[PDB]
Every structure is written in C-alpha cells, then in structure tokens.
C-alpha cells in the first residue's frame, strides 16, 4: 500500500449479510478501525450499515472461544476468496451432475488428491542421457 490516494473501488463493493470478509486495516484513515488484534482476521458479516459492516470473529480466551461482534468500516474490509473455491465448485458440480444425469454416465463427484502417476514410455531419441560424476569435471578444472 503506497502513500497518498486511496483507490476508489473500495467504496464500490456491495456488502451483504453472511459474506466472508477479512480485516485489512488501512493506515491512512483513522475512523472506524478495529483493535490492534482482529487485524488480518476473517469473519462473517452480520450487520451492514451506511458506511460500515459488522463482522463476527471468534476470539480465543484461556481454554475456550468467545464470539465477538465488531463494527469495521468498508475501507478496512475486503472480500475473501476463502469460499470462492466452494462457490465455483458447487456451481460446477451442480451443472456437471445435471449434465451427467441427463446423459446417463456417472462422473466423478468429489475432488481427488494427488494420485501416483501411471506408466508411460520415455524415448531416448535426440535426448540421450549424459553421464554425471559426483563432482563436475569443469568444477575440478
């Protein structure tokens, strides 16, 4: 963040209740800051006002968590892409499942982690292997 003028698209983001947003405190504007802690934290919008939003964070105290409701201005909040990977996945999976049910053939419905690679053939034509010593001979020179 450079010194000077705040970019104006901060004011053009539309905020609704239930949205997942993070708190990035802008040092330029002093009004509407949260505490020092609750900076860089992500929470749920529960109340939207004319120029600020209410965010639900869960602080930890001793051996338990306490719900906290904070009123932070739109200048210090930013939309969070934490559930972007969920919304894109649910739309893609919904339309793919509809298409698969229409076609008849079932498809993979769950994301799969990194499976081991299958067998394949590597040709040595024009890619003949070079022999390496434990130390490079140019380095020994």
């Amino acid at each position: 963040r450079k010194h000077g003028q705040i970019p104006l698209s901060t004011y053009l983001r539309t905020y609704r209740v239930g949205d997942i947003v993070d708190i990035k405190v802008n040092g330029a504007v002093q009004k509407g800051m949260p505490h020092k802690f609750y900076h860089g934290k992500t929470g749920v919008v529960y109340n939207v006002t004319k120029s600020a939003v209410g965010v639900i964070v869960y602080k930890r105290v001793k051996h338990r968590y306490i719900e906290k409701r904070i009123n932070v201005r739109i200048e210090h909040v930013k939309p969070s892409r934490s559930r972007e990977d969920f919304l894109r996945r649910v739309k893609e999976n919904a339309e793919l499942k509809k298409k698969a049910k229409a076609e008849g053939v079932p498809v993979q419905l769950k994301r799969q982690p990194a499976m081991p690679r299958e067998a394949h053939t590597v040709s040595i034509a024009d890619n003949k292997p070079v022999t390496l010593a434990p130390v490079a001979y140019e380095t020994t020179i």
């Binding site: 590597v122 040595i124 292997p129 070079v130 022999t131 390496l132 010593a133 130390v135």
Partner: protein, 174 residues
C-alpha cells in the same frame, strides 16, 4: 559396504508445459540394493542440478554386470573423502576380478586406514588399467612382476575349534 552391485540409474526432471522433454541424467552407482541406488542418485543429482525427488522421476535402474569376472584386472579408483580438515583426493589401485569387488575392497581399506565411512566417501572414477605400465603403486607393481613365485611360510593348520585337545604338537610347514 556390504555385497555391492553396480547400477545404471537414469533419472530426469518431471515434464512441464515449459519443458516437454527434460534432460536425462545417467549415473553408475555402487549400492547394496535399488533403494540405496536411487537414494544416492537423488543425493548426487541434488548436488549438481535443480532436480530433487519430489520434482523428478527415476526413468531406469539396471544392474551393470562385469563383462569378464574370471579375468584378473587392475583397477584405479579416484575418490574424494571427508575428514575433520576437509575434502581430500586419493588415487588408489586394487588388483581384483570385478569393479564391485574393487569398490568393496576400497571401502574396507579406507575404513581401515583412514576411518572413513560410506557417508564420507565419494567415488569419482573407477577405471581398468589396460597396460602394465599404468600400474603405479608398489604393492601391485610387485604383483605384476614377471615370474611371481613365492612360498607361504608359517601356515597355521586349520584345526576345528570344537576339538579342544590334540595329542601332538601341530606343524606349520604345509
């Protein structure tokens, strides 16, 4: 370092969109088994190039058998080893019948003479001395001598350890 075998290990970096055909790297590694051979391959390849096991693959592992194990040969081994001072070169030679036997004898000899373990010895080159004048160390220059005939004085006879008592004093002349 055990019953050693020599392995051709060819590996490469994983193919990406930028490099569809990465270069193949081949090494000759003396290891007891294929797991140790591939581990030493990844160690030496991490020492030279930007390839590690998580970003590369082992293309081939092949046992390199000796062409003539029944022919007595002289081998020159050029190696580097780690001491408390640092890295040092040694060139040594061994009169054996195979490269793996020469390397095993080298490992035993370096352990005996300089207390260097498998972790601190790098095998840089193993060559066959095709001619007699390539022999430089006196202990094999004395073995390649013309008409090498010697006796075996003071040979203790091989007596079974379970036979505790003998009735005559053994002779050491056979």
């Amino acid at each position: 370092m055990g019953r050693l075998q020599e392995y051709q290990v060819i590996g490469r970096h994983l193919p990406t969109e930028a490099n569809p055909n990465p270069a193949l790297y081949r090494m000759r590694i003396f290891a007891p088994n294929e797991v140790v051979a591939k581990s030493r391959f990844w160690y030496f390849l991490r020492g030279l190039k930007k390839v590690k096991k998580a970003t590369g693959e082992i293309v081939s592992v092949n046992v390199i058998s000796e062409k003539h194990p029944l022919k007595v040969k002289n081998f020159g081994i050029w190696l580097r080893y780690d001491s408390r001072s640092g890295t040092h070169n040694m060139y040594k030679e061994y009169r054996e019948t195979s490269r793996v036997a020469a390397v095993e004898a080298m490992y035993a000899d370096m352990a005996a003479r300089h207390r260097a373990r498998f972790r601190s010895i790098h095998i840089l080159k193993v060559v066959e001395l095709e001619k007699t004048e390539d022999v430089k160390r006196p202990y094999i220059k004395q073995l390649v001598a013309k008409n090498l005939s010697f006796p075996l004085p003071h040979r203790v006879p091989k007596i079974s350890t379970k036979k505790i008592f003998s009735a005559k004093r053994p002779s050491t002349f056979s």
